[PDB]
Amino acid sequence: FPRVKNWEVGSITYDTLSAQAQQDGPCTPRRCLGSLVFPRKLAPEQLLSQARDFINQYYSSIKRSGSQAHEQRLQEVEAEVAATGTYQLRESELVFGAKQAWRNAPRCVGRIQWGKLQVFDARDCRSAQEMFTYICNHIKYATNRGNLRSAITVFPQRCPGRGDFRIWNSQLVRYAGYRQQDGSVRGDPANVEITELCIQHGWTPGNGRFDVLPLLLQAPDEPPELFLLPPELVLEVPLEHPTLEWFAALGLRWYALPAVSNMLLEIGGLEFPAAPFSGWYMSTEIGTRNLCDPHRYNILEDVAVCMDLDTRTTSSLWKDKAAVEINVAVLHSYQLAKVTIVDHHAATASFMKHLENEQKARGGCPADWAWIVPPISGSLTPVFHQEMVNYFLSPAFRYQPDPW
Amino acid sequence: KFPRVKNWEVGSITYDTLSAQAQQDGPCTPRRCLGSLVFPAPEQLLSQARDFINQYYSSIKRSGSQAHEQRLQEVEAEVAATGTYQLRESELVFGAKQAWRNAPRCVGRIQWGKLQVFDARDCRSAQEMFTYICNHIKYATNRGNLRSAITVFPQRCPGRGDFRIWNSQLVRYAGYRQQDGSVRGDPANVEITELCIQHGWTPGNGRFDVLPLLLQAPDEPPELFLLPPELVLEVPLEHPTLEWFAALGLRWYALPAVSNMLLEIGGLEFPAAPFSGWYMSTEIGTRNLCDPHRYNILEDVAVCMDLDTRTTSSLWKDKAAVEINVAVLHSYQLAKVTIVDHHAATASFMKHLENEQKARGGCPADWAWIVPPISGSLTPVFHQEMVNYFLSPAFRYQPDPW
Ligand code: HEM
Ligand code: HEM
Ligand SMILES: Cc1cc(N)nc(CCc2cc(F)cc(CC[C@@H]3CCCN3)c2)c1
Ligand SMILES: Cc1cc(N)nc(CCc2cc(F)cc(CC[C@@H]3CCCN3)c2)c1
Ligand SMILES: Cc1cc(N)nc(CCc2cc(F)cc(CC[C@@H]3CCCN3)c2)c1
Ligand SMILES: C[C@H](O)[C@H](O)[C@H]1CNc2nc(N)[nH]c(=O)c2N1
Ligand SMILES: [Cl-]
Ligand SMILES: [Cl-]
Ligand SMILES: [Gd]
Ligand SMILES: [Zn+2]
Ligand SMILES: [Zn+2]
Ligand SMILES: [Zn+2]
C-alpha cells in the first residue's frame, strides 16, 4: 500500500486500489519507464474470469452484490460463453463499463465528469454508411451548438474470426497536413500520414492549413471508404486576442470538439476497437500543445515577432510570454464563441477534488503525473505537488495498432 | 531487451543499454509506477568496491592492467584487515564527478566534468569543518562568477560517529512561526530554524535572515557557527520594467549549496559532502518565491500588476509567474551572478543526453524533475522520453540527524 503525499498541504493517503491492479505496466524495480508514451508494445478461459470480475463490480456498484439477479447474471454469462465462446453486455452494463473506462484512464485530467457520459449503443451497426450516420449523430449531440456534452459511441465488439470495425482517423476532427517540395508541412504535421491515406483513397486535397480531413471508416473486412463531414457539423472557433488587435490577422482557428477515435475500449474481456469518445478541450491542449509544439503548428516565434518580444536571447523569456498570450487568445475566443472550454487551473483544481472523491469511494485513483500536470505553469497548479500512483484497471481505453 | 526511448519533437529513437547495469532497486513494479514519489556487511562492501575500482580503471583506459589488479587486491585485503578501505585522491575525484553524472534529478549535468573537489577527509573537529565550508563558499561564489565544487569530509567509519551538516543547504533563510500561526520568512526552514534557536542562536525577525550552520563532529552535539555576512552573496530582486517590484524587498542568495545528502562511492559513505553549483532561474522565481507553501508571493505580484485575479481564465497566475522569473534573471545578470534560464539549461541537458548515449549507452533521468516547473513543453526535454534508474557512485538521501 503505497504512501502518497501532497507536498503543498502535507496530507498523506494510502493507495489501496493499486493492489487490485491486474494488467502489468512497463516499470521494474531496476528502471522506471513512467515517461514513455507507449508502454512496452501494443482457450476462452480468461474471457470468463474477466467477465465475472466485470459483472461482480457492476453489481457492487448498485448495492446488489449478494442474492437476487446478481447471482442470476453470472450463470447467463457462463451459459453464453459455453454456448458461443463469448457474450453480450446488457445496455446498462455497457453504460457502466464505458464510464468506468473513463474513470480508470490515468492520463485524463477531466475525470471529475466521469459520471456524466452519454453512451450511444451502436453495437447493431453493420455497415460503413451506418457508421458514418452514428458518428454524425454523435458529433451533433456532443457539439450541441457549443454547449459541449461528453459522449461515446460503442460500435460492435470484436468477435473471433471476421473483421473489426475501425475508424482510421485518430480523432473525428483533424486538420490536413500537406508535405511539399521542402518536406515542410502546410497544416497539421501530426496528420501527414492520415492525409496521405485520405488522398490515396479518393480525397481531393484542399487549400491550406485548417482543412478538416474526411473520415476513413472501415466496416469488417470490406476496406475503408471515405466520408466527407458536412461543414455545418464541424463547429470551429476563429482565434482572436482580447487586446492584441493583429492576432486575428494570423488567421488561426481550432475546432470545438476533441473526439478520440483510435483507442480500444475493453470491458469484461470484450473488446470494442471502434468506440469514439469526446469531451471538451482544456485550453493548453490547443494553445500550448497544438499551436506551440515545434512538431505541430509551431507558431510561437510568429506570435513573438508580432509582440515585438526580444527573440535574440532565451533569458527574455519570450517563448513564455508568447505562449501565455496564445492561451489567453484561445480561452478568450472560445468564450466569445460560446464554446465550452476549461483553463488548466480550473481543470487541475477539479482533478484534485476528484482525487479526494476517489480516495473515499475506491481507496485510490490511478493517475499519470506527466500527463496530469499541464504543459505550461505546471507547479502553479495544485497537481504538481501531488504524488500519484500509475496502474492499469479494467474496464479501460487502450492504445491499439493502426489499421494498416 | 533494452528500453527503447523516443524523442517526440524530432523523431529520435535510442535504446538505454546502461539501465541494464542498474545497481539498486527503485519503487516501481510491473503492477504500479511510483516514479513521481519524492522519496522512493563485508561481502557486499567488496562487490561495490570492486565495481567502482573497475569503473575508475576504465576511465583511465587501464582496465585489466597490472595497476588495476593490484588495486583490486589491495582493497579486498584492506577490507579483510580493517572492515573498510580508503580511496586514493584520484579515485575520490573520479567518484565525486560520477555521483554528479549519475544524479537523475539534475538538469545541470552537462557540467559534470568541471567539478572542483576539495578533500577534507583529514577534518578533525567542528571548527575545522567550519573553516573548510567557508573556503568552499568563498571558492564557489568567486565574487559572482560561480564555480561548481564539492567538499568531502571523513567517511563513515565503524567506531566513530558521523560528520553531519544539519542544514539542508549551506545558505538558507530562517522561517519563524508567528502569532497568526503563520510563518515569517521561508516556511521550508521552520524545523531547522527552531533547532538553531534552541542551540543558542539569537533569532532575527526578517524575511531573509541567513541561518547559522549547525555542524556536528563525530560523537558530539551540533555546534552553531555564524556565516560572516561578506561570505554570503545575495541579489536584491528588481524588475526591468515593473519599478514597484524593487519595493517588495525581495532578495535571494547566489550560491545553491546542498549539504544534507550522502555521497556513496564504491561502498564507502560520506555523510557530509556539501556540493554547490549555480541556480537555474525557475528554482528561485517559480519554486522558492511562488510555491504557496513557500514565500507565496504570486497573488500579491499579480495584484500589483493590475491583473484580474477574480477568475483563473485571465491566466493571471501564469503572467505574474513569468514576470517574477524575468525579475530573477534580470536581477542576477545585473548583479553579475551566474544564473541560467530554463530554456538554456534544458537545451544543454539535451546535449548531455546525447553525449551520454555515445559514451555510456544512456543516461538515468527523472522526467518529472528534469522538466522545469513552468513552461515545461516549451523546452526540449518535455518531449524526450527518459529512463530513471540508480547508478553508483550516487548522491543519496539520508535521514535527518535529529
Ligand atoms: C469532459 C472534458 C474532458 C477533458 C477536459 C479531458 C481532458 C483530457 C486531457 C487534457 C488529456 C491528455 C492530457 C493532454 O493531452 O494535455 C486527456 C486524455 C484522455 N482522456 Fe480526457 N478529457 C475529457 C473527456 C474525456 C472523456 C469523455 C473520455 C472517455 C470517454 C476521456 C478519456 C481520456 C483518455 C482515455 C485519455 C488518454 C488518451 C490518450 O492516451 O491518448 N476524456 N483528457
Ligand atoms: C552547475 C550548475 C547546476 C545546475 C544548473 C543544477 C541544477 C539542478 C536543478 C534545477 C535540480 C532540481 C530540479 C529543480 O530544482 O527544478 C538539481 C538537482 C540536483 N543536482 Fe544539480 N545543478 C547544478 C550543479 C550540481 C552539482 C555541482 C551537483 C553535485 C556535484 C549537483 C547534484 C544535484 C543533485 C544530487 C540533485 C538532486 C537533489 C535532490 O534530489 O534533492 N548539481 N540540480
Ligand atoms: C476526450 C478528450 C478530451 C480532451 N480535452 N482531450 C483528450 C486527449 C486528446 C489528445 C491529447 C494528447 F496529448 C495527444 C493526443 C493524440 C493521441 C495520443 C498521442 C500519443 C498517445 N495518444 C490526443 C481527449
Ligand atoms: C517535480 C515534483 C513532483 C512532485 N510530486 N513533488 C515535487 C516537490 C518536491 C519538493 C521540493 C522541495 F523544495 C521540497 C520538498 C519537501 C522536502 C521535505 C521538507 C522537509 C524535509 N524534506 C519536496 C516536485
Ligand atoms: C547544486 C544544486 C544547484 C541547483 N541549482 N539546484 C540544486 C537543487 C536544489 C533543490 C531543488 C529542489 F526542488 C528541492 C530541494 C530541497 C531538497 C530536495 C527536496 C526533496 C528531496 N531533496 C533542493 C542543487
Ligand atoms: C516524453 C513524454 O512522456 C511525452 O512528451 C509526454 C509527456 N507528457 C505529456 N502530457 C500531456 N498532457 N500531453 C502529452 O502529449 C505529453 N507528452
Ligand atoms: Cl488535440
Ligand atoms: Cl533552492
Ligand atoms: Gd514601468
Ligand atoms: Zn515507474
Ligand atoms: Zn506537446
Ligand atoms: Zn514547488
mmCIF file of C-alpha atoms and ligand atoms in Angstrom, chain B residues 169 172 253 279 287-288, ligand 8:
data_model
loop_
_atom_site.group_PDB
_atom_site.id
_atom_site.type_symbol
_atom_site.label_atom_id
_atom_site.label_comp_id
_atom_site.label_asym_id
_atom_site.label_seq_id
_atom_site.Cartn_x
_atom_site.Cartn_y
_atom_site.Cartn_z
ATOM 1 C CA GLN B 169 21.724 23.889 2.345
ATOM 2 C CA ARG B 172 19.114 29.252 3.915
ATOM 3 C CA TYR B 253 21.224 34.264 -2.384
ATOM 4 C CA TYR B 279 20.888 28.493 -9.855
ATOM 5 C CA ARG B 287 9.716 27.320 -6.684
ATOM 6 C CA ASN B 288 11.082 29.422 -3.839
HETATM 7 CL CL CL C 8 16.699 26.276 -3.568
#
